[PDB]
Amino acid sequence: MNLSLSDLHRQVSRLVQQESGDCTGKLRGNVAANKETTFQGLTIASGARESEKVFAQTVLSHVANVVLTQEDTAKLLQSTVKHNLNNYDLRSVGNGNSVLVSLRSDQMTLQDAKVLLEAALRQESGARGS
Amino acid sequence: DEYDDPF
Secondary structure, eight states: OOOOHHHHHHHHHHHIIIIISSOEEEESSSEEEEOSSOOSSOOSSSSOOHHHHHHHHHHHHHHTTOOOOHHHHHHHHHHHHHSSOOOEEEEEETTTEEEEEEOSSSOOOHHHHHHHHHHHHHHSOSSSOO | OOOSSOO
C-alpha cells in the first residue's frame, strides 16, 4: 500500500543523499523532506507527522527482514544513534550484514527510510524486481 | 489522492 522499493529508494535516496542530508521523510504515495521538526518513533499520538509513521510501516513492511550489509547497518546506527529515542532494532550477522527489526513506535526518517529500503530494494527488488 | 508523482 505504498510506492515501489526501486522508486522509493530512488526518491528517498535522492533527497537524503542530496537534499535533506539525513532527515525525516514523509510518505503518502511519494517521499518528502522533513527538517522543521524531526521524529522519534512517535505514532503521531504525541506530536509526530502521520507521514513519518506511514513511512515507517512501509519501510518496515517492504523489508520485513532484508539483510543490511555494512552500509545499511551503520545506516540505521547513524539515523538511530544520531539524536536519541531508540525506535529501530538491529542484529548483525551475514558476515558483514545485519537483520533489521525496527519500530518501537511508528515514525521513520528519510535516512532510516532509505536504510531499510536500501536493504529492502537490495534484497527484494534491486533496480525494480519485486 | 496524495501527490501525483514522487521524487
